[PDB]
Amino acid sequence: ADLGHQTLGSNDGWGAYSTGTTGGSKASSSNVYTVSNRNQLVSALGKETNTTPKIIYIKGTIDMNVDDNLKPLGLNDYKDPEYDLDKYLKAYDPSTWGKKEPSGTQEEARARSQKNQKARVMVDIPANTTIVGSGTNAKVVGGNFQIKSDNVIIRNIEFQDAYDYFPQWDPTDGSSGNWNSQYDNITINGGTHIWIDHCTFNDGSRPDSTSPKYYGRKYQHHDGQTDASNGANYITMSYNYYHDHDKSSIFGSSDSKTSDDGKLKITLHHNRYKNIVQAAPRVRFGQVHVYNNYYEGSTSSSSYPFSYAWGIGKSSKIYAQNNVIDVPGLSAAKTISVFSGGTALYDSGTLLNGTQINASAANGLSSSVGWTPSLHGSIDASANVKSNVINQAGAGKLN
């Protein structure tokens, strides 16, 4: 079968659980589409009631920041008439405004401006859908795919620059505040039975290094690459190339969403993470199998300096096997970041800078997470992970 008609293997990670992940493999002939712009993509997907099996082939580059006639849209196109960047900044400057939450005219106009862009860039994927890139050059630019449904396959696409024109100031976000944006490349919002495979996620032409600092903080236009939230469950992400990006993969969005417990069952294998700052993945609550991934970066880099790989968040149950980390000067302990509520981590075969380490013991964590994965393919020796992943991960490695 071609990539359009293939299904996730019956042993291939948490996505193969119960009914599994077939996407739109069983689609009838009038439910197979080829799309090369925003209009065609949106016609193809249709609405949430469009649940028959379907296959969607992406041909070339699809820019999501366009109008109904496909003309490029920008800041002034989305801008609420009452929004102004100068006046937003004057309004909420810590010096005069303090640490209270931004409110009043500018923030309200910013929130309306954001919903204007959102309406173009953000798109829901209906149940029983396969979306695959044709050839080696399928791209989605500015786009944020959202999956709230069941049974979706996404393969062989380069996702670039999920860029928010209206970042929000949060003075209470960390010790000196932060700017936060809304668009991921893919948001799995209560979505189930999902396979994301042979995709590439990057920040395109607008990396964070082209953004100014306001209030001494990076004016952050980006959010996640592949985030999972609100009871997302039964997901495999395999052979993806994540590079040149700050916050990659946040699984479980809130310490309060105790309902995520027993959910966020996600399998990450054979993914490349180059020049990613943090959260690869950051986990709350979930049984996440992380194996045969390769991480590479620099703590002293000028655009995307390495902070951590695995986030041990509240009640997280990460089971890590034979992952390879290449960050010069990094200690065994600093491969991960431990958050309150985080007490446990299984890891075996972890290689840091060519040396075998125990990341869990290095951090004083419990070595058992109360589960062992049964659904997985072959496990590479740590000694072959770097080669296998570099050669195989990302868009345009198949076609």
Ligand X SMILES: O=C(O)[C@H]1O[C@H](O[C@@H]2[C@H](O)[C@@H](O)[C@@H](O[C@@H]3[C@H](O)[C@@H](O)[C@@H](O[C@@H]4[C@H](O)[C@@H](O)[C@@H](O[C@@H]5[C@H](O)[C@@H](O)[C@@H](O)O[C@@H]5C(=O)O)O[C@@H]4C(=O)O)O[C@@H]3C(=O)O)O[C@@H]2C(=O)O)[C@H](O)[C@@H](O)[C@H]1O
DSSP state of 126: P
Using CB under 6 A as the criterion, what x/- string covers residues 211-250 for binding ligand X?
Answer: ------------xx--x-xx----------------x--x
Beta strand segments in 117-212, E: 122-124, 129-133, 139-141, 144-147, 150-155, 158-160, 168-170, 178-180, 186-189, 192-197, 200-202
Stretch that binds Ca ion, among 41-49, 95-103, 151-159, 169-177 (CB under 5 A): 169-177
Give me the least distance between CB of 220 and Ca ion, in Å please. 8
Count CB atoms within 10 A of the CB of residue 47. 8
Tokens of 96: 């005069």
* Residue the block writes with tokens 């997470």: 369
Stretch that binds ligand X, among 172-180, 231-239, 268-276, 367-375 (CB under 6 A): 172-180
314 contributes a contact to ligand X by CB under 6 A: no
254 contributes a contact to ligand X by CB under 6 A: yes
Give SS3 for 359.
helix
Give me the least distance between CB of 352 and ligand X, in Å please. 21
**CA distances (Å), 369 to each of 287, 300, 333, 366, in order?**
8, 33, 18, 8
Give me the least distance between CB of 37 and ligand X, in Å please. 25
- Of 67 and 173, nearer to ligand X (C-beta) is 173
246 contributes a contact to Ca ion by CB under 5 A: no
Binding residues with ligand X: total (CB under 6 A): 18
**CA distances (Å), 3 to each of 33, 54, 55, 278, in order?**
14, 13, 10, 31
171 contributes a contact to ligand X by CB under 6 A: no
| Contact assessment for residue 164 and residue 183, using Cβ atoms and an 8 Å cutoff | yes
Which of the choices ligand X, Ca ion, none does residue 289 contact, using the CB cut-off of 5 to 8 A by kind? none
Identify the bridge partners of residue 141 per DSSP, sorted by sequence position. Answer: 63, 160
As a whole number of angstroms, the distance between CA 245 and CA 238 comes to 18
- Of 263 and 386, nearer to ligand X (C-beta) is 263
- Of 111 and 390, nearer to ligand X (C-beta) is 111
Stretch that binds ligand X, among 30-38, 40-48, 71-79, 175-183 (CB under 6 A): 175-183
Instruction: Select the residue interacting with Ca ion from 158, 184, 296, 380 (CB under 5 A).
Output: 184
| DSSP labels, 346-358 | EEES-EETTEE--
Residue ranges in contact with ligand X by CB under 6 A: 173-174, 178, 180, 182, 189, 223-224, 227, 229-230, 247, 250, 253-254, 282, 311, 339
Residue ranges in contact with Ca ion by CB under 5 A: 173, 178, 180, 184, 223-224, 227
